[PDB]
Write an enzyme that holds these catalytic residues in place. Sequence first.
Site, PDB file in Angstrom:
ATOM      1  N   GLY A   1       6.988   4.138   3.879  1.00  0.00           N
ATOM      2  CA  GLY A   1       7.452   5.238   4.689  1.00  0.00           C
ATOM      3  C   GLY A   1       8.949   5.140   4.941  1.00  0.00           C
ATOM      4  N   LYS A   2       9.446   6.103   5.717  1.00  0.00           N
ATOM      5  CA  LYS A   2      10.853   6.081   6.091  1.00  0.00           C
ATOM      6  C   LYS A   2      11.143   5.071   7.193  1.00  0.00           C
ATOM      7  CE  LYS A   2      11.197  10.419   7.228  1.00  0.00           C
ATOM      8  NZ  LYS A   2      11.750  11.687   7.782  1.00  0.00           N
ATOM      9  N   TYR A   3      10.137   4.692   7.979  1.00  0.00           N
ATOM     10  CA  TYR A   3      10.322   3.766   9.087  1.00  0.00           C
ATOM     11  C   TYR A   3       9.598   2.440   8.902  1.00  0.00           C
ATOM     12  CZ  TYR A   3      12.387   7.594  11.790  1.00  0.00           C
ATOM     13  OH  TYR A   3      13.195   8.614  12.236  1.00  0.00           O
ATOM     14  N   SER A   4       8.869   2.250   7.804  1.00  0.00           N
ATOM     15  CA  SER A   4       8.067   1.041   7.654  1.00  0.00           C
ATOM     16  C   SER A   4       7.589   0.913   6.214  1.00  0.00           C
ATOM     17  CB  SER A   4       6.870   1.044   8.609  1.00  0.00           C
ATOM     18  OG  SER A   4       5.929   2.038   8.240  1.00  0.00           O
ATOM     19  N   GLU A   5       7.101  -0.283   5.888  1.00  0.00           N
ATOM     20  CA  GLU A   5       6.381  -0.557   4.653  1.00  0.00           C
ATOM     21  C   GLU A   5       5.019  -1.141   5.003  1.00  0.00           C
ATOM     22  OE1 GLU A   5       8.569  -3.037   1.983  1.00  0.00           O
ATOM     23  OE2 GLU A   5       9.533  -1.338   0.979  1.00  0.00           O
ATOM     24  N   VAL A   6       3.983  -0.662   4.322  1.00  0.00           N
ATOM     25  CA  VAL A   6       2.599  -0.971   4.659  1.00  0.00           C
ATOM     26  C   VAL A   6       2.009  -1.851   3.567  1.00  0.00           C
ATOM     27  CG1 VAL A   6       0.346  -0.023   5.223  1.00  0.00           C
ATOM     28  CG2 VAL A   6       2.420   1.192   5.898  1.00  0.00           C
TER      29      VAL A   6
ATOM     30  N   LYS B   1       1.958  -3.493   8.903  1.00  0.00           N
ATOM     31  CA  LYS B   1       2.998  -2.472   8.821  1.00  0.00           C
ATOM     32  C   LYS B   1       4.321  -3.107   9.233  1.00  0.00           C
ATOM     33  CE  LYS B   1       3.901   1.387  11.576  1.00  0.00           C
ATOM     34  NZ  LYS B   1       3.732   2.806  11.996  1.00  0.00           N
TER      35      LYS B   1
ATOM     36  N   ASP C   1       2.804  14.003  15.019  1.00  0.00           N
ATOM     37  CA  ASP C   1       2.908  13.781  13.581  1.00  0.00           C
ATOM     38  C   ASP C   1       1.544  13.898  12.910  1.00  0.00           C
ATOM     39  OD1 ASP C   1       4.239  13.344  11.222  1.00  0.00           O
ATOM     40  OD2 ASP C   1       4.315  11.159  11.426  1.00  0.00           O
TER      41      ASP C   1
ATOM     42  N   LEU D   1       0.801  -1.217   0.000  1.00  0.00           N
ATOM     43  CA  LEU D   1       0.000   0.000   0.000  1.00  0.00           C
ATOM     44  C   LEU D   1       0.836   1.271   0.000  1.00  0.00           C
ATOM     45  CD1 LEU D   1      -2.852  -0.958   2.508  1.00  0.00           C
ATOM     46  CD2 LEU D   1      -2.845  -1.087   0.008  1.00  0.00           C
TER      47      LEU D   1
HETATM   48  O1  LIG Z   1      -6.082   1.175   6.262  1.00  0.00           O
HETATM   49  C1  LIG Z   1      -5.000   1.363   6.837  1.00  0.00           C
HETATM   50  C2  LIG Z   1      -4.919   0.874   8.265  1.00  0.00           C
HETATM   51  C3  LIG Z   1      -3.965   1.714   9.120  1.00  0.00           C
HETATM   52  C4  LIG Z   1      -2.756   2.232   8.440  1.00  0.00           C
HETATM   53  C5  LIG Z   1      -2.756   2.365   7.038  1.00  0.00           C
HETATM   54  O2  LIG Z   1      -1.519   2.874   6.624  1.00  0.00           O
HETATM   55  C6  LIG Z   1      -0.724   3.073   7.731  1.00  0.00           C
HETATM   56  C7  LIG Z   1       0.598   3.573   7.775  1.00  0.00           C
HETATM   57  C8  LIG Z   1       1.201   3.685   9.023  1.00  0.00           C
HETATM   58 BR1  LIG Z   1       3.032   4.372   9.154  1.00  0.00          BR
HETATM   59  C9  LIG Z   1       0.541   3.325  10.197  1.00  0.00           C
HETATM   60  O3  LIG Z   1       1.151   3.440  11.423  1.00  0.00           O
HETATM   61  C10 LIG Z   1      -0.764   2.836  10.108  1.00  0.00           C
HETATM   62 BR2  LIG Z   1      -1.688   2.336  11.717  1.00  0.00          BR
HETATM   63  C11 LIG Z   1      -1.433   2.696   8.886  1.00  0.00           C
HETATM   64  C12 LIG Z   1      -3.853   2.029   6.171  1.00  0.00           C
HETATM   65  C13 LIG Z   1      -3.978   2.237   4.792  1.00  0.00           C
HETATM   66  N1  LIG Z   1      -5.100   1.860   4.066  1.00  0.00           N
HETATM   67  C14 LIG Z   1      -5.381   2.144   2.666  1.00  0.00           C
HETATM   68  C15 LIG Z   1      -4.419   2.867   1.930  1.00  0.00           C
HETATM   69  C16 LIG Z   1      -4.663   3.156   0.577  1.00  0.00           C
HETATM   70  C17 LIG Z   1      -5.827   2.746  -0.044  1.00  0.00           C
HETATM   71  C18 LIG Z   1      -6.780   2.031   0.682  1.00  0.00           C
HETATM   72  C19 LIG Z   1      -6.539   1.740   2.034  1.00  0.00           C
END
Ligand SMILES: O=C1CCc2c(oc3cc(Br)c(O)c(Br)c23)/C1=C/Nc1ccccc1
Lengths: 330, 330
Positions: free
Chosen positions: A47-52, A67, A155, A44
Amino acid sequence: SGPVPSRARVYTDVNTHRPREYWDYESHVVEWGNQDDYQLVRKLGRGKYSEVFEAINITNNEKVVVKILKPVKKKKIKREIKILENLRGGPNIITLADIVKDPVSRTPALVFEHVNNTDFKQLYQTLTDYDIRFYMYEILKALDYCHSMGIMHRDVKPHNVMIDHEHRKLRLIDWGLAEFYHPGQEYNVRVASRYFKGPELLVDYQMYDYSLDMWSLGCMLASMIFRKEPFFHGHDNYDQLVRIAKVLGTEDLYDYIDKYNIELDPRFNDILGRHSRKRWERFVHSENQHLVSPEALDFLDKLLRYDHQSRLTAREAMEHPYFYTVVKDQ
Amino acid sequence: SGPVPSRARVYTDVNTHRPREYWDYESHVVEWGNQDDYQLVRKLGRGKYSEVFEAINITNNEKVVVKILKPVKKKKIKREIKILENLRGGPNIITLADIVKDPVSRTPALVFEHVNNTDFKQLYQTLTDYDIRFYMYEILKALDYCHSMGIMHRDVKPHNVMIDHEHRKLRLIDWGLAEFYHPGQEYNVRVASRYFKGPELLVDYQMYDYSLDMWSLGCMLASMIFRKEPFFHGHDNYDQLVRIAKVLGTEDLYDYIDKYNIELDPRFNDILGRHSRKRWERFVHSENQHLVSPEALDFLDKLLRYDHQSRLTAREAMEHPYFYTVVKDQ
Ligand SMILES: O=C1CCc2c(oc3cc(Br)c(O)c(Br)c23)/C1=C/Nc1ccccc1
Ligand SMILES: O=C1CCc2c(oc3cc(Br)c(O)c(Br)c23)/C1=C\Nc1ccccc1
């Protein structure tokens, strides 16, 4: 003589009256879960500290969000885990579902509830006047809760505010920079995004508090009602304060500097100069006038202050005539 | 009025009939060996209370395991040493070979027999129905022995059960939390892992006994036959009891509380609620059906009880129709 100390005007001694294990996150023992319960579907973001990643809990076919943390000091990992657990169940706070260790990275990977987010680069241009007030009130409920829990987010920015517009749902995310507030503690000023850094971060005043989050909120509000994201669009930390000084004026800035006996970086001398406090009508035009109102300007003015003590608290902000229509509908 | 006292229904007065020095570990003098007899080969893992190394006894070229203890109160070291020596030679109990102190660091290092362990995260997924019954019977032999010796392990979990699958060998390890049982004594409820804490630990009933180990055994058995690690997957100590209440129901929980006049932490009010006693078929699916049987569910039900007095003893468990095939093969 040194800088003048400062205390939070609300929720000052909340952490002191808590058991030690509430805020002593270094002594927190992580209870790891089963990594094989989640299969990654797609990435998805980075970031600089993680990949989601978006994943599926194969135990119950639930959409989750994993994450995977980039390698950082375990103290910062325990801090984020402890804060997420302390704030779990709070209004508009993201829910930490599980903690697992990734096979490849051999790193903690936090599992969160899924939120079908609408991109703020596409959402904000479609927000009405009522949509802005409604979501500002939802962010304020999350900020007031975590501040009452003795935690500052540090943040706040549109990227860290996930919104499911179809269901009018909002979750505050990214607690990797959050920290427990303790009276008298001096914190790292290199936190938050540059566009949302409070003046206390830009002039290096380390004894700040929850009021830092309120400045970032005003920056978000300014971007939405004026259709200028980000509002203070600076190139670096020094130019960021100059962009702020061209709007809020320099007289109040030096008063803030004289009040807390902050010594300025001499680089600010040749770039700050003299600027008058501009009226918000300067940024109003035909494309954003339907979002600007006397309530919005009064509420925005009470948030964007140099003196962190003079900014509205999250609870005071929720009681502003700007959210009157939102509160009665709620 | 206070909580209602409780006694173990088996092995109640075994320590009372022993000489004082059997259970008075505070007055135990440690018999130190020669630290120069062991050379460390490689590290095997890190716990919160110790670091585990593979070593060689250069006196006889024997593979051993050296557990270097992290700094803890010497009373707790005497307790672990005394229990290991009292239980030495018992069935499926790890053997304490020697105790040494580093000359420079002055740090305790316990020396154990070597066991070529197979990781349970890789072993359990390859275990058949008979493999689970056989090893559960081996754990019960160790528990019945140490209970008859007046000792409760207080930390039974897959990590503390070393299995050498090639030789069908099993050893119960990590006796750092074990304690002698004394009738009427109130113990620390902050023991064992969160997923294996008995209900008496979660509601803070300090006058518990050997039956605590039997609850942990049911947690292990449930995870192995249902392919669910951990089975009761709680976020904290409070949520751990809620996860248990969602399976065993809340009617029996409040009966257990009213029977022993336990006063609940008011935090439990808003999270427990009302839940019915679920049937074990809910956790049966196509991936674990070859491990679930009427015997396994009947045996598991007789272990996972709120009332610690109503749980099976280790000897009663060994005489269950679940281990009938195991016993005849013996
Ligand atoms: O739905 C979530 C759950 C929480 C979360 C998300 O990204 C993060 C990044 C960090 Br850093 C973090 O700490 C958290 Br908690 C989260 C996230 C993203 N959804 C999404 C993105 C694009 C399209 C459709 C849905
Ligand atoms: O043969 C022994 C003696 C007892 C023991 C062992 O590990 C422990 C860890 C803790 Br913590 C503890 O308290 C104890 Br006692 C022990 C162990 C062997 N482990 C092993 C083997 C192969 C790979 C990885 C680990």
